A paper describes a structure:
Inhibition of the protein-protein interaction between [name] and [name]β represents an attractive alternative strategy due to the crucial role of [name] and its selective involvement in the canonical NF-κB pathway. We have previously reported the design and characterization of a coiled-coil stabilized [name] construct encompassing the [name]β-binding region fused to two ideal dimeric coiled-coil adaptors, at the N and C-terminus. Here we report the structure of the unliganded N-terminal domain of [name], utilizing the coiled-coil stabilized [name] construct modified by four additional point mutations, designed to improve solution behavior and crystal packing. The crystal structure reveals that [name] folds in an irregular dimeric coiled coil in the absence of [name]β, with discontinuities in the heptad repeats causing an underwinding of the supercoil in the ligand binding region.
The mutation [name] was introduced to provide an additional site for selenomethionine labeling, to aid in phase determination ([name]-[name]). Ile65 was chosen for its expected buried position within the coiled coil, providing a more rigid methionine than that of the natural sequence Met94. The SeMet labeled [name] mutant was prepared to facilitate the phasing of the EEAA structure, but displayed weak anomalous signal, and the structures were instead solved by molecular replacement. The [name] mutation affects the opening of the hot-dog bun increasing the interhelical spacing of the three heptad repeats starting at residues 65, 72 and 79 to the values observed in the [name]β-bound structure. The longer side chain of Met65 extends deep in the interhelical cleft and the structure accommodates it by increasing the interhelical spacing by 1.4 Å and rotating the second Met65′ away from the center of the bun. This increased spacing seems to trigger the opening of the bun in the following heptads, till the end of the stutter “heptad”. The open region encompasses ligand binding pockets I and II. After residue 82, and approximately at the start of pocket III, the [name] structure closes back to resemble the apo structure, confirming the role of [name]β in maintaining an open pocket III. The conformation of pocket III is instead almost identical in the [name] mutant and [name]-EEAA structure, both in interhelical spacing and in side chain conformations, with an RMSD = 0.372 Å over all backbone atoms within residues 89–104. The data suggest that [name]-[name] unfolds more easily and more completely than the other two constructs, due to the prevention of a compact packing of the dimer at the beginning of the discontinuous region, caused by Met65, and destabilization of the packed regions of the coiled coil.
Numbering used by the authors:
A (entry chain A): 20 to 142
B (entry chain B): 19 to 141
Write the structure that this text describes.
């Protein structure tokens, strides 16, 4: 059907077609190798994000427990002091009432002393 | 005119089988590159969500600690004022107790003087 020259021209055509397809394979392998390397950089950085996020969540749980331990201890110191103010103030009022009753006894004893001394400047 | 018609036809079949192999490689490498590009997009879309969540939580922690620091300032500043109030009331209570002991000694002396003055007038 086909001559020698026609088969040679088709051979020349197929060889140029093999050369083009081989440049595509080499181009697609360079692309795939960069994309696989880019996927490795994204996976190493995403691993670090989850790893820092886990580290910061575990140190925050122990920090909140320490803040609770410090907040309880300062609070109990404020309550012990406030109660001490209420007790010192009431004991101060009970001492001031007792002192004013004593002054009334002294004022009565002083009047009694003067009354008896006018009696002795007569006898 | 080196090669015959039958030799050129067998070579033609040979070049075609190489094109069929290269065409399966190109289609295979395009599926790999397309899957890898899609995987990188899923990693970059998730990386951006993590960074946006990580950015919100760092801003909610920055403002939360500022209130914790201000509640620690306010519960502490109340405890300092109470301690000052305890030390002041303690001095006022000690001088009221000294006055109470001063008054009781005065009463006992005035009563002895009253009895002595009553014995002079015979009351």
């Amino acid at each position: 059907s086909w001559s020698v020259k026609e088969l040679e021209d088709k051979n020349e055509e197929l060889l140029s077609e093999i050369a083009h397809l081989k440049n595509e394979v080499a181009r697609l392998k360079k692309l795939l190798q960069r994309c696989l390397a880019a996927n490795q950089e994204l996976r190493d950085a995403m691993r670090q994000s989850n790893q820092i996020l886990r580290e910061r969540a575990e140190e925050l749980l122990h920090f909140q427990a320490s803040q609770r331990e410090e907040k309880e201890f300062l609070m109990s110191k404020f309550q012990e002091a406030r109660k001490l103010v209420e007790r010192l103030g009431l004991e101060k009022l009970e001492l001031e009432d007792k002192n004013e009753e004593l002054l009334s006894e002294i004022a009565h004893l002083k009047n009694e002393v003067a009354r008896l001394k006018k009696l002795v400047g007569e006898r």
